[PDB]
mmCIF file of C-alpha atoms and ligand atoms in Angstrom:
data_model
loop_
_atom_site.group_PDB
_atom_site.id
_atom_site.type_symbol
_atom_site.label_atom_id
_atom_site.label_comp_id
_atom_site.label_asym_id
_atom_site.label_seq_id
_atom_site.Cartn_x
_atom_site.Cartn_y
_atom_site.Cartn_z
ATOM 1 C CA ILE A 1048 8.202 7.059 6.727
ATOM 2 C CA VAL A 1049 4.824 6.606 5.359
ATOM 3 C CA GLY A 1050 3.628 3.841 2.879
ATOM 4 C CA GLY A 1051 5.395 0.889 4.411
ATOM 5 C CA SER A 1052 2.641 -0.804 6.630
ATOM 6 C CA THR A 1053 1.733 -4.266 6.147
ATOM 7 C CA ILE A 1054 -1.656 -5.054 4.228
ATOM 8 C CA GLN A 1055 -3.049 -8.471 4.552
ATOM 9 C CA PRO A 1056 -6.683 -8.775 3.386
ATOM 10 C CA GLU A 1057 -6.075 -12.678 3.267
ATOM 11 C CA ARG A 1058 -6.201 -12.594 7.119
ATOM 12 C CA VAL A 1059 -9.830 -11.623 7.026
ATOM 13 C CA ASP A 1060 -12.927 -13.672 5.544
ATOM 14 C CA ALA A 1061 -14.815 -11.893 2.603
ATOM 15 C CA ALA A 1062 -18.180 -11.522 4.579
ATOM 16 C CA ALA A 1063 -16.385 -9.695 7.439
ATOM 17 C CA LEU A 1064 -14.580 -7.364 5.015
ATOM 18 C CA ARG A 1065 -17.891 -6.915 3.166
ATOM 19 C CA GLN A 1066 -19.504 -5.837 6.345
ATOM 20 C CA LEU A 1067 -16.614 -3.527 7.249
ATOM 21 C CA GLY A 1068 -17.096 -2.015 3.641
ATOM 22 C CA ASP A 1069 -20.774 -1.494 4.312
ATOM 23 C CA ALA A 1070 -20.096 0.376 7.599
ATOM 24 C CA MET A 1071 -17.535 2.522 5.683
ATOM 25 C CA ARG A 1072 -20.053 3.368 3.094
ATOM 26 C CA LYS A 1073 -22.220 4.920 5.544
ATOM 27 C CA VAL A 1074 -19.691 7.114 7.562
ATOM 28 C CA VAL A 1075 -16.486 7.676 5.263
ATOM 29 C CA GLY A 1076 -16.390 10.892 3.203
ATOM 30 C CA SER A 1077 -19.399 12.542 5.055
ATOM 31 C CA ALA A 1078 -19.358 14.953 8.052
ATOM 32 C CA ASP A 1079 -20.573 12.345 10.754
ATOM 33 C CA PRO A 1080 -17.439 11.824 13.124
ATOM 34 C CA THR A 1081 -17.943 8.262 13.981
ATOM 35 C CA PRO A 1082 -15.057 6.131 15.492
ATOM 36 C CA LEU A 1083 -14.594 4.525 12.029
ATOM 37 C CA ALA A 1084 -14.606 7.876 10.325
ATOM 38 C CA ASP A 1085 -12.186 9.175 12.706
ATOM 39 C CA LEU A 1086 -9.864 6.018 12.552
ATOM 40 C CA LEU A 1087 -9.717 6.294 8.696
ATOM 41 C CA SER A 1088 -9.256 10.007 8.914
ATOM 42 C CA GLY A 1089 -5.879 9.707 10.815
ATOM 43 C CA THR A 1090 -7.533 10.328 14.315
ATOM 44 C CA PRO A 1091 -6.695 8.009 17.119
ATOM 45 C CA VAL A 1092 -9.934 6.235 18.611
ATOM 46 C CA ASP A 1093 -11.320 4.467 21.613
ATOM 47 C CA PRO A 1094 -11.484 0.789 20.705
ATOM 48 C CA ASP A 1095 -14.551 0.285 22.894
ATOM 49 C CA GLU A 1096 -16.193 2.993 20.967
ATOM 50 C CA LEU A 1097 -15.076 1.508 17.706
ATOM 51 C CA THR A 1098 -16.402 -2.010 18.941
ATOM 52 C CA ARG A 1099 -19.938 -0.388 19.541
ATOM 53 C CA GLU A 1100 -19.718 0.764 15.852
ATOM 54 C CA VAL A 1101 -18.448 -2.166 13.825
ATOM 55 C CA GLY A 1102 -18.614 -5.136 16.363
ATOM 56 C CA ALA A 1103 -15.803 -7.147 17.814
ATOM 57 C CA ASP A 1104 -15.772 -8.934 14.473
ATOM 58 C CA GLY A 1105 -15.366 -5.602 12.754
ATOM 59 C CA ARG A 1106 -12.788 -4.650 15.120
ATOM 60 C CA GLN A 1107 -10.798 -7.747 14.764
ATOM 61 C CA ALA A 1108 -11.032 -7.541 10.946
ATOM 62 C CA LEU A 1109 -9.582 -3.995 11.099
ATOM 63 C CA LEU A 1110 -6.442 -5.396 12.942
ATOM 64 C CA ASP A 1111 -5.856 -8.569 11.206
ATOM 65 C CA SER A 1112 -5.950 -6.685 7.709
ATOM 66 C CA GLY A 1113 -3.705 -4.070 8.742
ATOM 67 C CA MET A 1114 -6.266 -1.466 8.483
ATOM 68 C CA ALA A 1115 -5.857 -0.413 12.155
ATOM 69 C CA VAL A 1116 -3.181 -0.746 14.770
ATOM 70 C CA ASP A 1117 -3.740 -1.303 18.450
ATOM 71 C CA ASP A 1118 -1.367 1.215 20.132
ATOM 72 C CA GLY A 1119 -2.540 -0.083 23.555
ATOM 73 C CA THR A 1120 -5.519 2.222 24.697
ATOM 74 C CA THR A 1121 -6.210 3.676 21.160
ATOM 75 C CA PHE A 1122 -6.549 2.406 17.628
ATOM 76 C CA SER A 1123 -4.899 4.188 14.795
ATOM 77 C CA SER A 1124 -4.739 3.621 11.008
ATOM 78 C CA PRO A 1125 -2.019 3.972 8.499
ATOM 79 C CA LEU A 1126 -4.722 4.323 5.838
ATOM 80 C CA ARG A 1127 -7.059 7.046 4.924
ATOM 81 C CA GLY A 1128 -10.579 6.174 3.690
ATOM 82 C CA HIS A 1129 -12.712 7.544 0.749
ATOM 83 C CA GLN A 1130 -15.990 7.026 -0.581
ATOM 84 C CA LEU A 1131 -16.266 7.692 -4.405
ATOM 85 C CA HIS A 1132 -19.206 7.016 -6.621
ATOM 86 C CA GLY A 1133 -20.652 4.179 -4.500
ATOM 87 C CA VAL A 1134 -17.160 2.746 -4.088
ATOM 88 C CA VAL A 1135 -15.259 2.674 -0.608
ATOM 89 C CA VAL A 1136 -11.367 2.832 -1.132
ATOM 90 C CA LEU A 1137 -8.525 3.102 1.409
ATOM 91 C CA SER A 1138 -5.058 4.363 0.451
ATOM 92 C CA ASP A 1139 -2.020 6.074 2.126
ATOM 93 C CA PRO A 1140 -2.442 9.597 3.544
ATOM 94 C CA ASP A 1141 -1.346 12.341 1.198
ATOM 95 C CA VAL A 1142 2.319 13.336 2.373
ATOM 96 C CA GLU A 1143 5.264 15.021 0.938
ATOM 97 C CA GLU A 1144 7.595 13.020 -1.433
ATOM 98 C CA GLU A 1145 10.314 13.040 0.951
ATOM 99 C CA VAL A 1146 8.652 10.794 3.680
ATOM 100 C CA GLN A 1147 7.132 8.369 1.397
ATOM 101 C CA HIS A 1148 8.256 4.760 1.566
ATOM 102 C CA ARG A 1149 9.124 3.140 -1.839
ATOM 103 C CA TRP A 1150 5.826 0.908 -1.606
ATOM 104 C CA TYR A 1151 3.812 4.141 -0.954
ATOM 105 C CA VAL A 1152 0.619 4.132 -2.844
ATOM 106 C CA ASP A 1153 -1.033 7.096 -4.583
ATOM 107 C CA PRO A 1154 -3.397 8.684 -2.094
ATOM 108 C CA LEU A 1155 -6.060 9.385 -4.744
ATOM 109 C CA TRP A 1156 -4.487 12.731 -5.874
ATOM 110 C CA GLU A 1157 -6.624 12.632 -8.965
ATOM 111 C CA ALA A 1158 -8.887 9.562 -8.972
ATOM 112 C CA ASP A 1159 -12.074 11.400 -8.109
ATOM 113 C CA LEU A 1160 -11.643 13.713 -11.063
ATOM 114 C CA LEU A 1161 -10.670 10.885 -13.255
ATOM 115 C CA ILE A 1162 -13.731 8.733 -12.716
ATOM 116 C CA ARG A 1163 -15.800 11.649 -13.738
ATOM 117 C CA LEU A 1164 -13.816 12.036 -17.024
ATOM 118 C CA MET A 1165 -13.907 8.291 -17.837
ATOM 119 C CA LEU A 1166 -16.480 7.469 -20.551
ATOM 120 C CA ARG A 1167 -19.669 5.664 -19.179
ATOM 121 C CA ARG A 1168 -19.494 2.558 -21.346
ATOM 122 C CA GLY A 1169 -19.165 -1.105 -20.433
ATOM 123 C CA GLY A 1170 -17.775 -4.161 -22.123
ATOM 124 C CA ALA A 1171 -16.008 -7.520 -21.692
ATOM 125 C CA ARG A 1172 -12.576 -6.998 -20.407
ATOM 126 C CA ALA A 1173 -10.847 -3.850 -18.824
ATOM 127 C CA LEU A 1174 -7.148 -3.266 -17.802
ATOM 128 C CA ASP A 1175 -6.150 -0.938 -14.933
ATOM 129 C CA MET A 1176 -2.517 -0.255 -15.776
ATOM 130 C CA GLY A 1177 -0.813 0.809 -12.472
ATOM 131 C CA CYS A 1178 -3.876 0.160 -10.304
ATOM 132 C CA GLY A 1179 -2.330 1.359 -6.979
ATOM 133 C CA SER A 1180 -5.136 1.341 -4.311
ATOM 134 C CA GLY A 1181 -7.470 -0.315 -6.987
ATOM 135 C CA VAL A 1182 -9.932 2.748 -7.346
ATOM 136 C CA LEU A 1183 -10.241 2.788 -11.011
ATOM 137 C CA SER A 1184 -10.591 -0.941 -11.300
ATOM 138 C CA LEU A 1185 -13.401 -0.881 -8.546
ATOM 139 C CA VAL A 1186 -15.255 1.621 -10.547
ATOM 140 C CA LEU A 1187 -14.745 -0.184 -13.964
ATOM 141 C CA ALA A 1188 -16.005 -3.647 -12.186
ATOM 142 C CA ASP A 1189 -19.575 -2.328 -12.335
ATOM 143 C CA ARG A 1190 -19.417 -2.126 -16.098
ATOM 144 C CA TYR A 1191 -17.032 -4.948 -17.027
ATOM 145 C CA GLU A 1192 -17.342 -8.602 -17.198
ATOM 146 C CA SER A 1193 -13.719 -8.748 -15.843
ATOM 147 C CA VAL A 1194 -11.331 -6.162 -14.639
ATOM 148 C CA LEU A 1195 -7.492 -6.762 -14.346
ATOM 149 C CA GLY A 1196 -5.423 -4.489 -12.257
ATOM 150 C CA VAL A 1197 -1.731 -4.459 -12.515
ATOM 151 C CA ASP A 1198 0.872 -2.863 -10.533
ATOM 152 C CA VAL A 1199 4.662 -3.481 -9.758
ATOM 153 C CA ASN A 1200 4.329 -2.173 -6.193
ATOM 154 C CA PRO A 1201 3.284 -5.453 -4.176
ATOM 155 C CA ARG A 1202 1.637 -3.359 -1.482
ATOM 156 C CA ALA A 1203 -0.517 -1.721 -4.029
ATOM 157 C CA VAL A 1204 -1.630 -5.162 -5.248
ATOM 158 C CA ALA A 1205 -2.550 -6.278 -1.614
ATOM 159 C CA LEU A 1206 -4.378 -2.860 -1.032
ATOM 160 C CA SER A 1207 -6.178 -3.349 -4.294
ATOM 161 C CA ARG A 1208 -7.593 -6.839 -3.031
ATOM 162 C CA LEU A 1209 -8.451 -5.470 0.319
ATOM 163 C CA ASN A 1210 -10.594 -2.622 -1.233
ATOM 164 C CA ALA A 1211 -12.325 -4.955 -3.816
ATOM 165 C CA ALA A 1212 -13.318 -7.316 -0.803
ATOM 166 C CA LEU A 1213 -14.526 -4.232 1.102
ATOM 167 C CA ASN A 1214 -16.757 -3.468 -1.674
ATOM 168 C CA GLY A 1215 -17.882 -7.026 -2.130
ATOM 169 C CA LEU A 1216 -16.459 -7.019 -5.833
ATOM 170 C CA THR A 1217 -15.526 -10.394 -7.143
ATOM 171 C CA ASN A 1218 -15.220 -9.898 -10.931
ATOM 172 C CA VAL A 1219 -11.632 -8.147 -10.390
ATOM 173 C CA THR A 1220 -8.140 -9.578 -10.568
ATOM 174 C CA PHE A 1221 -4.967 -7.963 -9.335
ATOM 175 C CA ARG A 1222 -1.668 -9.044 -10.338
ATOM 176 C CA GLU A 1223 1.922 -7.916 -9.415
ATOM 177 C CA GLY A 1224 4.244 -7.220 -12.411
ATOM 178 C CA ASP A 1225 6.019 -4.802 -14.882
ATOM 179 C CA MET A 1226 3.487 -2.715 -17.262
ATOM 180 C CA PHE A 1227 2.007 -5.158 -19.819
ATOM 181 C CA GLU A 1228 3.948 -8.198 -18.588
ATOM 182 C CA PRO A 1229 1.233 -9.814 -16.710
ATOM 183 C CA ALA A 1230 -1.621 -8.676 -19.029
ATOM 184 C CA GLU A 1231 -2.117 -11.255 -21.646
ATOM 185 C CA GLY A 1232 -4.297 -11.014 -24.789
ATOM 186 C CA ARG A 1233 -6.275 -7.915 -25.355
ATOM 187 C CA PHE A 1234 -8.774 -5.618 -23.608
ATOM 188 C CA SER A 1235 -11.765 -3.526 -24.605
ATOM 189 C CA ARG A 1236 -10.878 -0.963 -22.042
ATOM 190 C CA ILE A 1237 -7.543 0.155 -20.732
ATOM 191 C CA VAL A 1238 -7.201 2.877 -17.996
ATOM 192 C CA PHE A 1239 -3.758 4.485 -16.922
ATOM 193 C CA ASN A 1240 -3.397 6.986 -14.257
ATOM 194 C CA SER A 1241 0.235 7.166 -15.306
ATOM 195 C CA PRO A 1242 3.220 7.698 -12.795
ATOM 196 C CA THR A 1243 4.306 10.786 -14.539
ATOM 197 C CA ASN A 1244 4.588 14.327 -13.302
ATOM 198 C CA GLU A 1245 7.588 16.710 -12.806
ATOM 199 C CA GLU A 1246 10.312 14.380 -13.644
ATOM 200 C CA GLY A 1247 10.394 14.681 -17.243
ATOM 201 C CA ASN A 1248 12.620 11.942 -19.018
ATOM 202 C CA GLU A 1249 14.091 10.807 -15.536
ATOM 203 C CA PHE A 1250 13.039 7.786 -13.678
ATOM 204 C CA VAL A 1251 12.523 8.972 -9.953
ATOM 205 C CA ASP A 1252 10.324 6.325 -8.426
ATOM 206 C CA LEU A 1253 7.183 4.275 -8.809
ATOM 207 C CA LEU A 1254 4.935 7.526 -9.004
ATOM 208 C CA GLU A 1255 7.239 9.439 -11.276
ATOM 209 C CA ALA A 1256 8.674 6.866 -13.633
ATOM 210 C CA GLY A 1257 9.630 9.302 -16.512
ATOM 211 C CA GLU A 1258 8.245 9.730 -20.089
ATOM 212 C CA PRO A 1259 9.773 6.124 -21.100
ATOM 213 C CA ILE A 1260 7.144 4.654 -19.202
ATOM 214 C CA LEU A 1261 4.494 6.285 -21.554
ATOM 215 C CA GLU A 1262 6.493 5.199 -24.684
ATOM 216 C CA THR A 1263 6.249 1.576 -23.337
ATOM 217 C CA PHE A 1264 2.545 2.053 -22.521
ATOM 218 C CA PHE A 1265 1.719 3.463 -25.977
ATOM 219 C CA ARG A 1266 4.018 1.463 -27.986
ATOM 220 C CA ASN A 1267 2.129 -1.677 -26.722
ATOM 221 C CA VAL A 1268 -1.499 -0.280 -26.716
ATOM 222 C CA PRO A 1269 -2.076 -1.166 -30.539
ATOM 223 C CA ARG A 1270 -1.497 -4.960 -29.701
ATOM 224 C CA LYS A 1271 -3.295 -4.920 -26.287
ATOM 225 C CA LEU A 1272 -6.520 -3.325 -27.542
ATOM 226 C CA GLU A 1273 -9.496 -4.971 -28.678
ATOM 227 C CA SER A 1274 -11.134 -3.729 -31.983
ATOM 228 C CA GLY A 1275 -13.342 -0.885 -30.965
ATOM 229 C CA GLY A 1276 -11.531 -0.535 -27.594
ATOM 230 C CA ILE A 1277 -11.055 2.493 -25.305
ATOM 231 C CA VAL A 1278 -7.993 3.743 -23.771
ATOM 232 C CA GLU A 1279 -7.958 6.462 -20.970
ATOM 233 C CA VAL A 1280 -4.768 8.083 -19.813
ATOM 234 C CA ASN A 1281 -3.945 10.682 -17.110
ATOM 235 C CA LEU A 1282 -0.415 11.956 -17.825
ATOM 236 C CA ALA A 1283 2.103 14.872 -17.884
ATOM 237 C CA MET A 1284 3.295 16.003 -21.311
ATOM 238 C CA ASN A 1285 6.545 17.888 -21.981
ATOM 239 C CA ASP A 1286 6.583 19.820 -25.307
ATOM 240 C CA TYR A 1287 10.078 21.153 -26.349
ATOM 241 C CA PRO A 1288 10.862 23.628 -29.218
ATOM 242 C CA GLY A 1289 10.797 21.755 -32.394
ATOM 243 C CA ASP A 1290 9.878 18.566 -30.501
ATOM 244 C CA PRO A 1291 6.122 18.412 -29.380
ATOM 245 C CA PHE A 1292 5.039 15.385 -27.247
ATOM 246 C CA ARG A 1293 2.156 14.854 -29.649
ATOM 247 C CA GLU A 1294 4.523 13.840 -32.432
ATOM 248 C CA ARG A 1295 6.444 11.335 -30.155
ATOM 249 C CA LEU A 1296 3.134 10.082 -29.087
ATOM 250 C CA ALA A 1297 2.003 9.482 -32.743
ATOM 251 C CA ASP A 1298 5.115 7.621 -33.377
ATOM 252 C CA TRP A 1299 4.684 5.297 -30.370
ATOM 253 C CA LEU A 1300 1.068 4.545 -31.348
ATOM 254 C CA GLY A 1301 1.932 4.235 -35.076
ATOM 255 C CA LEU A 1302 -1.084 6.480 -34.864
ATOM 256 C CA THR A 1303 -1.877 6.731 -38.629
ATOM 257 C CA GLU A 1304 -0.940 3.250 -39.590
ATOM 258 C CA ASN A 1305 -3.233 1.791 -36.858
ATOM 259 C CA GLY A 1306 -6.171 4.149 -37.473
ATOM 260 C CA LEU A 1307 -6.299 5.265 -34.003
ATOM 261 C CA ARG A 1308 -8.458 8.411 -32.782
ATOM 262 C CA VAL A 1309 -6.675 10.253 -30.289
ATOM 263 C CA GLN A 1310 -8.103 13.218 -28.211
ATOM 264 C CA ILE A 1311 -6.100 15.233 -25.734
ATOM 265 C CA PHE A 1312 -7.902 17.408 -23.074
ATOM 266 C CA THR A 1313 -5.085 19.718 -21.624
ATOM 267 C CA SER A 1314 -5.866 21.262 -18.280
ATOM 268 C CA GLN A 1315 -2.942 22.684 -16.851
ATOM 269 C CA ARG A 1316 0.222 24.295 -18.307
ATOM 270 C CA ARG A 1317 3.662 25.000 -16.868
ATOM 271 C CA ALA A 1318 7.032 26.590 -17.994
ATOM 272 C CA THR A 1319 9.850 24.178 -18.124
ATOM 273 C CA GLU A 1320 13.513 24.538 -18.869
ATOM 274 C CA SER A 1321 15.134 24.110 -22.277
ATOM 275 C CA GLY A 1322 12.351 26.543 -23.377
ATOM 276 C CA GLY A 1323 10.064 23.640 -22.844
ATOM 277 C CA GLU A 1324 6.266 23.675 -21.833
ATOM 278 C CA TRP A 1325 4.833 20.990 -19.439
ATOM 279 C CA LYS A 1326 1.272 20.263 -19.536
ATOM 280 C CA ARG A 1327 -1.159 17.840 -17.543
ATOM 281 C CA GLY A 1328 -4.159 16.438 -19.219
ATOM 282 C CA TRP A 1329 -6.527 13.563 -20.144
ATOM 283 C CA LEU A 1330 -5.890 11.400 -23.218
ATOM 284 C CA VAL A 1331 -8.488 9.208 -24.815
ATOM 285 C CA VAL A 1332 -8.453 6.622 -27.563
ATOM 286 C CA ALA A 1333 -11.874 5.754 -28.546
ATOM 287 C CA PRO A 1334 -13.399 4.477 -31.866
ATOM 288 C CA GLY A 1335 -13.551 7.065 -34.314
ATOM 289 C CA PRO A 1336 -11.980 9.063 -37.276
ATOM 290 C CA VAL A 1337 -7.950 8.491 -37.495
ATOM 291 C CA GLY A 1338 -6.112 11.516 -36.111
ATOM 292 C CA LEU A 1339 -5.076 13.255 -33.091
ATOM 293 C CA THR A 1340 -6.984 16.446 -31.565
ATOM 294 C CA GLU A 1341 -6.024 18.598 -28.650
ATOM 295 C CA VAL A 1342 -8.429 20.881 -26.967
ATOM 296 C CA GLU A 1343 -8.124 23.207 -23.881
ATOM 297 C CA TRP A 1344 -10.279 22.037 -20.889
ATOM 298 C CA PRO A 1345 -9.173 23.409 -17.441
ATOM 299 C CA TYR A 1346 -11.120 20.778 -15.558
ATOM 300 C CA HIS A 1347 -8.705 20.927 -12.573
ATOM 301 C CA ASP A 1348 -9.560 24.869 -12.272
ATOM 302 C CA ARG A 1349 -13.325 23.909 -12.983
ATOM 303 C CA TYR A 1350 -14.127 20.667 -10.995
ATOM 304 C CA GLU A 1351 -11.300 19.612 -8.540
ATOM 305 C CA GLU A 1352 -13.835 20.233 -5.750
ATOM 306 C CA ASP A 1353 -16.736 19.176 -8.077
ATOM 307 C CA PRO A 1354 -18.012 17.367 -11.105
HETATM 308 N N1 7XP B 546 -0.682 9.485 -11.016
HETATM 309 C C1 7XP B 546 -0.101 10.544 -10.402
HETATM 310 C C2 7XP B 546 -0.506 11.883 -11.022
HETATM 311 O O1 7XP B 546 -1.976 11.930 -10.822
HETATM 312 C C3 7XP B 546 0.073 13.182 -10.312
HETATM 313 O O2 7XP B 546 -0.321 13.382 -9.217
HETATM 314 C C4 7XP B 546 0.060 14.629 -8.612
HETATM 315 C C5 7XP B 546 0.557 14.642 -7.159
HETATM 316 O O3 7XP B 546 1.540 13.808 -6.917
HETATM 317 C C6 7XP B 546 0.834 16.125 -6.666
HETATM 318 O O4 7XP B 546 1.249 15.858 -5.235
HETATM 319 C C7 7XP B 546 2.274 16.590 -4.746
HETATM 320 O O5 7XP B 546 1.678 17.618 -3.780
HETATM 321 C C8 7XP B 546 1.150 16.967 -2.672
HETATM 322 C C9 7XP B 546 0.730 17.947 -1.806
HETATM 323 O O6 7XP B 546 -0.239 18.867 -2.292
HETATM 324 C C10 7XP B 546 2.411 16.175 -1.833
HETATM 325 O O7 7XP B 546 1.766 15.647 -0.494
HETATM 326 C C11 7XP B 546 2.771 15.148 -2.700
HETATM 327 O O8 7XP B 546 3.694 14.314 -2.109
HETATM 328 C C12 7XP B 546 3.315 15.774 -3.949
HETATM 329 N N2 7XP B 546 3.438 14.602 -4.986
HETATM 330 C C13 7XP B 546 -0.346 16.971 -6.618
HETATM 331 N N3 7XP B 546 -0.114 18.177 -5.842
HETATM 332 C C14 7XP B 546 -0.893 17.084 -8.027
HETATM 333 C C15 7XP B 546 -1.335 15.760 -8.631
HETATM 334 N N4 7XP B 546 -1.668 15.962 -9.946
HETATM 335 O O9 7XP B 546 1.428 12.993 -10.501
HETATM 336 C C16 7XP B 546 1.979 11.572 -9.675
HETATM 337 C C17 7XP B 546 1.562 10.682 -10.580
HETATM 338 O O10 7XP B 546 2.015 9.348 -9.887
HETATM 339 N N1 SAH B 547 6.421 -0.277 -14.334
HETATM 340 C C1 SAH B 547 5.139 -0.417 -13.802
HETATM 341 N N2 SAH B 547 4.302 -1.338 -14.046
HETATM 342 C C2 SAH B 547 2.952 -1.313 -13.461
HETATM 343 N N3 SAH B 547 2.755 -0.290 -12.705
HETATM 344 C C3 SAH B 547 3.495 0.657 -12.675
HETATM 345 C C4 SAH B 547 4.900 0.618 -12.853
HETATM 346 N N4 SAH B 547 5.437 1.750 -12.571
HETATM 347 C C5 SAH B 547 4.528 2.572 -11.797
HETATM 348 N N5 SAH B 547 3.322 1.981 -11.591
HETATM 349 C C6 SAH B 547 2.276 2.264 -11.063
HETATM 350 O O1 SAH B 547 1.406 3.315 -11.647
HETATM 351 C C7 SAH B 547 0.713 4.142 -10.543
HETATM 352 C C8 SAH B 547 0.566 5.414 -10.831
HETATM 353 S S1 SAH B 547 -0.488 6.367 -9.494
HETATM 354 C C9 SAH B 547 -2.086 5.600 -10.094
HETATM 355 C C10 SAH B 547 -2.682 4.773 -8.946
HETATM 356 C C11 SAH B 547 -4.089 4.463 -8.971
HETATM 357 N N6 SAH B 547 -4.442 3.743 -10.362
HETATM 358 C C12 SAH B 547 -5.086 5.666 -8.853
HETATM 359 O O2 SAH B 547 -5.603 6.208 -9.873
HETATM 360 O O3 SAH B 547 -5.214 6.125 -7.874
HETATM 361 C C13 SAH B 547 1.427 3.435 -9.233
HETATM 362 O O4 SAH B 547 0.544 2.828 -8.392
HETATM 363 C C14 SAH B 547 2.752 2.932 -9.440
HETATM 364 O O5 SAH B 547 2.961 1.805 -8.570
HETATM 365 MG MG1 MG B 548 8.491 10.399 -5.208
#
């Protein structure tokens, strides 16, 4: 089972982690097969070669944090490395649902896509709801005085702190908790790579939590959002005959009474039962004329392996 490994950033000093991060930045996500790159790709590596690359300091940092395991004559990693838009991010390997631990962290299914979708504005205070590996938070930290990442998965919170230290980022905070419970006051930016996919209304697990998690999210948005604030959400939406997602959403948001401008970009569509239709898209609340707008944009087909 994958996603249960111990993650302990507190067991390594910040300077060492930062320097590991700097070594990752050079080799992770490129074509050079260094020990480090191999390690964070799922390939076992020779510790003496790893030591050549990142030093005994680096080698010990990999082990003490849980990034690598000493299997005797080789090291392996439970984690996989990524380098996105200047940021290095470790997460779990992408594996089928049936072998995921309950504390499995989103292996960056959509994150590289989402960052390209995200508005390139900055501001005071950002919130990354369901931060998982921390990836969206790490990106937002460049632009915001302060970023708060929230997850109900304690392993995600630890992984987030690890990844922030690897990148030397210190204006980010990560908190374990349930949706908005640990998020006090208001935010100028809220990002939500929602745990919704094929489960419809049913709660399945942390990565497919059901439509009610969106209702909870959107019902609270008006009181968590600063004036002129921006909300961005990746989500699956179910339309049923006589019951479109957009109208339930409008009700949750109190869309008209709150003067929110909503724009939905629908990328993928699927047939579902009850004559329903499933869609995946990118939802943006941004300052502008009250109302909801939906447009077609097959950005999965277009980008996926691109910008
Ligand atoms: N935030 C995410 C959202 O981005 C989305 O992610 C999807 C991802 O889970 C799916 O992953 C499935 O297929 C993979 C093989 O391809 C299998 O290893 C996987 O365990 C399985 N799950 C992807 N194929 C498509 C993604 N959009 O739904 C889950 C939410 O928690
Ligand atoms: N009730 C809840 N409160 C806070 N986070 C939750 C939650 N239920 C599920 N989540 C989290 O929502 C995340 C969805 S996957 C998104 C992970 C990350 N932000 C990324 O883009 O890669 C998971 O990390 C899951 O643990
Ligand atoms: Mg699952």
